[PDB]
RNA sequence: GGGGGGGG
DNA sequence: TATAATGGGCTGATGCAGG
DNA sequence: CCTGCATCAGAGCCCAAAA
């Protein structure tokens, strides 16, 4: 009944009184220091559902990643608005990125092994330890690294560099390390005799990166 | 972990874990607060900057927000957000009406009455007429909102067996039944902790049921009997109009000791 | 401005779940229930009480009320007290609290994300006597039931399980609330059956079936008498405000007389009878009339039969039956002179 | 979102 | 209680956002 | 300030009125 009696008392328009009574909009009793779009939320302000959700529960967004495509950012990483998340995915807001469902889990297992190697003497650089990537030796001319035991070859190839393991019966008699710059001349499951070349080492040979 | 013992992924030996190919990336505007020891706030609690989160007071919150406790990542997330009080419906309005000191508003509105532009004085008058109305009368504005809804005595909305043994009933009974259902259903949805979307829908339906009972058709579509276009006759409809209570049973009546014939 | 459209707009603000997300929420809800079970044992509390306390903190301060069955009035004092005992748990126990919280959070999300399913089921049930929104709310009640009973391990999609409970909930709603005169759910089912049966019979026979034709089709136990009695029960009342045609100036209720309140004549008649009735028991003697008056009662209706009269009339007990006959006998003589009471025989 | 066959 | 099913079918009196 | 301009509540009596 216009002018609304409730409406007149509260300084609420016809539309406003409708929106609160019929659940189209919130009206704020105690802002508790909220601020929206740069201005502080003042008591008796009307909020839409979207405004209330941004205020009350915070703002967030979820971006689909094309199947098989891996993201250009890591789980937990702070992100600016506009930063590129995936080849086809661009983030719309600042905040913490969270992985939803990793399709592939890679476990890097820790291996600590004792392996031997033989090099000329004028060609090797003396160090007490070698960091990944560090130059191990420089060969004036190509050198053939030879088997020091007879056995069948168990070949284990890394990303770069290789491991080679000779065994008689099932007991490994030797563990060799082939750095980068050393090309295996034998294949897995190959029979070798003492003194035959396993790998050619040419030029500068260095620790692999991993 | 998986549904059945097979297909689980168990770590073969010592190693470190890397996550790849996520289904989607969720960007949250939030602060991350890692914790080594026990965490003292559980998830869902609301928190203000400086409030102690975990590890006996070592780690605390930088923002106002909502606690998300990640037991995998071993971190307490705080999603930036406020304890803001904002409501919908007649519940909200009844509070603001309760929170009225009419004395003060009269004072305020009188000060506005000392002002040109005529319109300022005109609107302050209309407001002041409602304020003064309540003050003299003794009515509390929050009474314009119903908590208990009255139910008219039954003989005034009868269910009677007519000649044929058939039942005839007043429309008010159907309007009340709708009301009762929605009230009862609302109580159940509350006790069962339905999401706000469901409770909001029920609450707004409840307003509509009360609205049809008091004045049907006044706001929104008129409530009708199933398979009839006839608007149900509400209390407002009963009071008013040519057929209404005043012009039919009050200002004129059928009478005894009367007759009629051709002249 | 349109309540249906608004609700449709609000549901559409929650994106639908992926198979992973659907399974994730379902998983979290199940695990959370297991967590609440464990917390009862450790704490010595009640799983329902624990469930409501966990649930209160997720929804917020907005919803706090007594829940039917809980032994304690649920108010901020008791939930602070009880929450502080849960937060008083050791690290390995206190973890179970966190599980329960996230279960309630996920339950909320799962329900909200399935609301569009309920709409698509309810729209097919329109026209049975419940409004669309009433059906949605009853349908939503079933959806809530479905989330609590869902076992995600079975690998069925959620939509598959939910649909059963929602259909059940709507159908129970329609059966319970659609009639002004409420009918037991099982009886409503039988009535609907007669309709289906009769509609077949009329479609094959090319004319309306008899009670007998329906009774055969219904099988054993059914005769025409039972078909007739069931339909009577199934008759819905009609509005007193139904216009009698003309629609301008006539209501059905205006033609219904009031049979309860006595008419002026009837009230007059009953008054006249009491006055002539007392003016008659006093004309023999009040006392042998008082004994008789005591046996029937002007106002009260004090007829036993033989015992009670053992006490206070003034005589012992066989005698009052006798003075009853002579009171009635003198009355009968006294009646032939003052034969004015004949006309009250109708 | 307000309305109709006859008699005066 | 479990294939999956996910967004409806003619007038006058008065109080208002807008040239 | 004022006007378009919108939203609401009015529209004769009694008797048959054939539902």
Swiss-Prot record, chain A:
Q: Where are the transmembrane segments?
A: none
Name the domain of life.
Bacteria
Q: What does this protein do?
A: DNA-dependent RNA polymerase catalyzes the transcription of DNA into RNA using the four ribonucleoside triphosphates as substrates.
Belongs to which family? Belongs to the RNA polymerase beta' chain family.
- Tell me the subunit arrangement: The RNAP catalytic core consists of 2 alpha, 1 beta, 1 beta' and 1 omega subunit. When a sigma factor is associated with the core the holoenzyme is formed, which can initiate transcription.
Protein name listed in UniProt:
DNA-directed RNA polymerase subunit beta'
């Amino acid at each position: 009944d216009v002018p609304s009696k409730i409406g007149t008392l509260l300084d609420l328009s016809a539309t406003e009184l409708e929106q609160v009574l019929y659940f189209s909009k919130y009206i704020v009793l105690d802002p508790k220091g909220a601020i929206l779009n740069g201005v502080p939320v003042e008591k008796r302000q009307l909020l839409t559902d979207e405004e209330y959700r941004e205020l009350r529960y915070g703002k967030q967004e979820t971006y689909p990643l094309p199947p098989g495509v891996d993201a250009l950012v890591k789980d937990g990483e702070e992100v600016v608005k506009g930063q590129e998340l995936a080849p086809g995915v661009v983030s719309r807001l600042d905040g913490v990125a969270l992985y939803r469902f990793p399709r592939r889990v890679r476990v890097e297992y820790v291996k600590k092994e004792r392996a031997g190697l033989r090099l000329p003497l004028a060609a090797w650089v003396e160090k007490e330890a070698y960091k990944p990537g560090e130059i191990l030796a420089e060969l004036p001319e190509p050198y053939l690294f030879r088997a020091e035991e007879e056995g069948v070859v168990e070949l284990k190839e890394l990303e770069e560099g290789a491991f080679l393991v000779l065994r008689r019966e099932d007991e490994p008699v030797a563990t060799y390390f082939l750095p980068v710059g050393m090309t295996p001349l034998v294949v897995h499951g190959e029979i070798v005799e003492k003194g035959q070349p396993l790998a050619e080492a040419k030029g500068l040979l260095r620790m692999p990166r991993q | 972990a998986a549904i059945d013992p097979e297909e689980e992924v168990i770590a073969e030996a010592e190693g470190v874990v890397h996550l790849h190919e996520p289904a989607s990336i969720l960007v949250v505007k939030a602060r991350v607060y890692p914790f080594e020891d026990d965490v003292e706030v559980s998830t869902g609690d609301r928190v203000a900057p400086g409030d102690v989160l975990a590890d006996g007071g070592k780690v605390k919150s930088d923002v106002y927000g909502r606690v998300e406790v990640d037991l995998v990542r071993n971190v307490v997330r705080v999603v930036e957000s406020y304890d803001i009080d904002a409501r919908m419906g007649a519940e909200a309005i009844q509070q603001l009406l309760k929170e009225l000191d009419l004395e003060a508003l009269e004072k305020e509105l009188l000060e506005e009455m000392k002002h040109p532009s005529r319109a300022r004085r005109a609107k302050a008058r209309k407001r002041l007429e409602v304020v003064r109305a309540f003050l003299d009368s003794g009515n509390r504005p929050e009474w314009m909102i119903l908590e208990a809804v009255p139910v008219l005595p039954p003989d005034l909305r009868p269910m009677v067996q007519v000649d044929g043994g058939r039942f005839a009933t007043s429309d008010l009974n159907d309007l009340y039944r709708r009301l009762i259902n929605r009230n009862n259903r609302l109580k159940k949805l509350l006790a069962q902790g339905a999401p706000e979307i469901i409770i909001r829908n029920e609450k707004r339906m409840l307003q509509e049921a009360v609205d049809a009972l008091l004045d049907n058709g006044r706001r929104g579509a008129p409530v009708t009997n199933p398979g009839s276009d006839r608007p149900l006759r509400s209390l407002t409809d009963i009071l008013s109009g040519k057929q209404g209570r005043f012009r039919q049973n009050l200002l004129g009546k059928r009478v005894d000791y009367s007759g009629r014939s051709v002249i | 401005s349109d309540p249906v459209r608004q609700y449709l707009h609000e549901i559409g603000q929650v994106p639908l779940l992926t198979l992973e997300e659907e399974v994730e929420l379902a998983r979290k809800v199940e695990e959370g229930m297991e967590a609440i079970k464990k917390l009862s044992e450790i704490t010595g509390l009640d799983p329902d009480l624990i469930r409501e306390v966990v649930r209160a903190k997720i929804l917020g301060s907005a919803r706090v009320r007594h829940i039917p069955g809980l032994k304690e009035t649920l108010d901020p004092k008791t939930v602070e007290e009880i929450d502080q005992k849960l937060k008083s748990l050791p690290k390995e126990h206190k973890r179970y609290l966190h599980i329960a919280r996230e279960g309630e959070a996920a339950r909320q999300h799962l329900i909200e994300a399935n609301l569009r399913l309920v709409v698509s089921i309810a729209k097919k049930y329109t026209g049975r006597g419940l409004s669309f929104l009433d059906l949605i709310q009853e349908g939503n009640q079933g959806l809530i039931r479905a989330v609590e009973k869902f076992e995600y391990k079975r690998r069925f999609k959620f939509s598959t399980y939910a649909t059963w409970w929602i259909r059940q909930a709507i159908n129970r709603a329609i059966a319970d609330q659609a009639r002004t005169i409420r009918i037991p759910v099982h009886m409503v089912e039988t009535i609907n059956k007669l309709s289906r049966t009769a509609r077949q019979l009329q479609q094959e026979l090319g004319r309306e079936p008899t009670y007998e034709e329906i009774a055969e089709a219904m099988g054993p136990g059914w005769d025409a008498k039972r078909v007739e009695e069931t339909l009577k029960i199934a008759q819905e009342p009609v509005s007193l405000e139904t216009p009698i045609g003309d629609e301008k100036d006539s209501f059905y209720g205006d033609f219904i007389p009031d049979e309860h309140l006595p008419s002026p004549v009837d009230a007059a008649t009953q008054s006249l009878l009491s006055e002539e009735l007392e003016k008659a028991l006093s004309k023999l003697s009040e006392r042998e009339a008082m004994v008789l008056k005591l046996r029937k009662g002007l106002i009260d209706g004090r007829e036993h039969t033989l015992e009670e009269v053992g006490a206070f009339f003034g005589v012992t007990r066989e005698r009052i039956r006798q003075i009853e006959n002579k009171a009635l006998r003198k009355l009968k003589y006294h009646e032939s002179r003052t034969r004015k009471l004949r006309d009250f025989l109708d």
